[PDB]
Assembly symmetry: C5
């Protein structure tokens, strides 16, 4: 039961941070990149290495203790940090033609963010149910051919960084009552990154009843994926490239019953 | 059918929540959500697609709490495609886009469609090629003529069965469907990129200009979907339709009706 | 002089119909298609076959007799019928690559519809003024080089089916006071068809003074072109492909003077 | 100072016309086309011929004479506009280059510029040059005394669009530091394979009033209409390419407004 | 503390100017262009030359002097802005690379970044590197003490845009953790074949007020304008490619606001 909003100067707080991408980081020089992508010769033999798999980013942010009152997330400012870095077309890339500049980062992208008063709830869906996911990742267990469309057994919480592969999990639409999520998948080899930045855009997190996410245990959950596309090396080999996401969340104290 | 007042109170509302799985053809035990590889006929007259190569409309008839006159009225819809990120698997028997590159992602012709109604979706048949021989186990336009390629009014049907009505044969009948709200987009082309948005903050209102939503006859709600996302190209170059499930959340209210 | 709208039960009527496309119909099996498209060696030698030229569609629809009172067209629901037929990529098409599916219908499209209380008024504009238009078509007469940009002599009414080729006629913006018209040309070889369907979308036909088309002699004129693109056969030859268009028009009785 | 609008039946007027494109017209058969585009041997030797340079179109339209007695001005309030002959681009059967073996001709596509303006005086222009060493041909009016700075911004390059078939599109843009008495709208879409997307309707109106509710005020009772509609390039069988343009329709509603001094 | 807006005729002022692009300018003839883009032999040896790197543009404009007697600040309320010389990109004849045999030259296209900001102080920057092992050249101001973490987020890389021709576009973005006194807007469109889409009009206004109705407040009576308008790349006959940029127009309306402490 949700009651009145607390007023006064000390009834509002602000959370501001960046969430770094988790693309796989195949070596000590390649933070923000995945391992080069290899292709299995059969569906059965699909066994992607961990460093070749982008994962969901998550941050649990402790808020000022209130221990009743709960912090209510009201607004979000967000954007991708470092969009201009993708203009580097001179770092040993693949020339688009004889004497031309390097092919810029492009192709399949997934841009996603969520704000919640608890962990993002996930539903597993697999492109290929026989894909063998690597040690150190948390993936849909007991997969069947029905996992390729919908298997209700695959429920999870995004409760660990560098663990939940993007391609395995989506937000669970049957749950997430205490989270607001937003995502766009743009698929295609030649898809151009279109990345907007501005400090003038605000997203309201209140639902139809004027209630935003309520932070259980005084914790705010922020989640992100920003796979911008792929970088193509001189050799033709391709790596996912990701960027950090900025979050600014304004919260207010709200009284709750039971 | 005279529409009267909406019932109020705690017990005057109900909620329907479910998913509709895609029916792309499922050519073997490992390929649920895919069609059979697409083959091309030598001539127009020899077009004879196998059943597992034809995506079909999905449909669910959902029984609602018995009311009886009162009818359940569908007011709002939340919907989205489930598993959009699976299309990031470009490492599973795909065709490299160039030497040493990643696999070609799912792309090309897509049809995304959903409808909410108080009765079965009404269909009109339109054929690309009237001489196409459609396979046993599918329900297709019968007594086809050359006019079926543009508009033959004989081809009327109800979306009343799963794995049955091929997408390429049927569209919602715009001359009917008074008690249904439907929404669809065909994006054609070999290289069309999937653009798939997800969010739990978007609601579609199902009320018409008179403030009346679909009215559920016999206390049944009808949900229909097609989500052909594009084609997957395997290493050999052969191509298969790939579909994904669609989530539906519908809010309904009790409404009194006369006669 | 436009006076008051009549109210009451019988003061409204509805028109519902479909207009079939006229793409050329080169044989008894190819309704909805044009003949294969060929290319003349020069501008002077351009002589398109009748069945290679899509034409405007028109329907004159008689309304309930009134007599002053006139039927006023207020709203329109419209959509292209059979959009899913374009998913037939298995019928004598050209493979996109080795082992691939058939190339779908794509390329130059023209989607157009109008609702009027009289025939759609046309202005002729020619891509090439030396084009010889074939017997059985109604085309701009006494063409000069100025016809390639604007020759005011080329005035016509869309008053016949299978007659007015799409490529040499457009709605006359200097006239059509009693018609509401809407069209989009999307040109280019590889342009993807984007076709939306819904029964929830209504277009209001009233002008800035709140007055819709007024039906002279109790006739409603509906016009359409839906060239969806080109179908490419095995050999690589290309044919225009069209689809039918649904119209639902709501009309009301309006009193007019003189 | 801008005062009250005059009312009554004769306090309103309408201007309706079309502006033809000026693409270069290389011969007696090619109105609406430019000459085939040729590429200079070196960057410094860029020297386009007049008939391969599209130019801005302009018409000055006389309005009903005001102030016969010993001040009223016509004020432009609304605009209806569209490109005339959009369907002509469906001619893919006339001396074109096939898109593939046995295919239809390549349609008009690629770099486009669609522009229109309505003003109570000539459209004011600012010159910007892609290449300052380009030699612009006799018969055109172009930025003079060009320097390397002309490639980005040289404030010397000021002009009025006061002549048809004269001001090359590639040299000139509306001057944003001026044009207080004009409303202008333009879109450049660059790229070799850009699809023309051309909408037509008689239901769309642009309001020409500024934030104070004042439209262009017609000095000397003259209305200035300007346009560019380069739709893209037509590619012939040989592969040579020509700009293709189309006419633009204008309908402007005007009202009498009283002005001080 | 922000108090009331001052009214009267002298309580408003206007700033109008153009910001020229800084693309590299490799020689005396190539203002608005970068040096041709070279590719490093290995990933770790990335070493772009100065004239190959587009930089952020910045202008600080002095406003009418306030507080002559012993606080009023200029408040930026509205902005009109557009790219100047969009039509110049229609020059497809200046020794470019023919799209096909006998075709016109390939137009400027590909990766673009269009950005602008209005603030009462220097735009605040955060550094993000595509490749932390990139050696950035003398004459540029770049993220120092780069680590592998610089490829995603290294909070050490803070800077002010306080110098023209200095801060490379690829190294720096607006810092979203700062910039309280600035309004910024930017779009990156990446990809070799990306078509430039450039709109111009004198009828579009951006309001600079925040949710509390307060615009940028100009410290020391100075207005800061920043821009990047990399439109894409020009391809030479030989296939070599150069960034091409254009100038940006700014018109800013300001009002006097009283401030406490
Ligand atoms: C430095 C480099 O990219 N080397 C490539 C090599 O490139 C050479 C080749 O193209 C020849 C062709 O004649 O040309 C050489 O350059 C010559 C030049 O043309 C000439 O003008 C001049 O005078 O002389 C030089 C000769 O020195 C090129 O140097 O090609 C081979 C075969 O394609 C590559 O081998 C493959 O290496 C793979 C791992 O290396 C990479 C990769 O994937 O390509 C290198 C990337 O730079 C690196 N990218 C990043 C962002 O770190 C990636 C990345 O770390 C991982 O992929 C992440 O998982 O690694 C792999 O071993 C594969 O099996 C080899 O075939 C060689 O890299
Ligand atoms: C003028 C020019 O572009 N020259 C090129 C030269 O082009 C010749 C070549 O294509 C041959 C092929 O057979 O054809 C010649 O023309 C013939 C024509 O085809 C035929 O029909 C006719 O009958 O006969 C003529 C005979 O002349 C062409 O003239 O090709 C070479 C090799 O690719 C180029 O050398 C390279 O030059 C580089 C620097 O030059 C440029 C460049 O990068 O291309 C020239 C650009 O014009 C210039 N652009 C601008 C906007 O200023 C740029 C720019 O200044 C810088 O890049 C900035 O950084 O410089 C470079 O030195 C490289 O190493 C050389 O290989 C030659 O330029």
């Amino acid at each position: 039961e949700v009651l009145e909003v607390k007023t006064g100067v000390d009834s509002i707080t602000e959370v501001e941070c960046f969430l770094t991408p988790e693309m796989g980081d195949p070596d000590e020089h390649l933070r923000g990149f995945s391992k080069s992508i290899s292709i299995s010769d059969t569906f059965e033999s699909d066994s992607p290495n961990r460093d070749m798999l982008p994962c969901y980013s998550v941050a649990r942010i402790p808020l000022p203790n209130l221990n009743i009152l709960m912090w209510e997330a009201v607004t979000l400012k967000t954007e991708v940090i470092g969009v201009t870095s993708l203009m580097n077309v001179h770092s040993n890339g693949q020339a688009t033609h004889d004497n031309g500049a390097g092919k810029p980062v492009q192709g399949t992208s997934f841009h996603f963010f969520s704000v919640g008063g608890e962990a993002l709830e996930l539903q597993g869906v697999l492109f290929n149910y026989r894909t063998k996911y690597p040690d150190g990742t948390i993936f849909p267990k007991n997969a069947t051919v029905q996992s390729q469309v919908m298997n209700t057994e695959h429920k999870a919480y995004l409760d660990k960084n560098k663990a939940y592969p993007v391609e395995c999990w989506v937000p669970d639409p049957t749950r997430n009552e205490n989270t607001r999520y937003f995502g766009t998948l743009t698929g295609g080899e030649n898809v151009p990154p279109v990345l907007h930045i501005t400090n003038t855009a605000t997203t309201v997190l209140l639902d139809e009843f004027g209630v935003g996410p309520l932070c259980k245990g005084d914790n705010l959950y922020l989640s992100a994926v920003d796979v911008c596309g792929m970088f193509t090396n001189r050799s033709g080999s391709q790596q996912w490239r990701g960027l950090s996401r900025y979050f600014k969340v304004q919260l207010r104290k709200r009284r709750v019953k039971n």
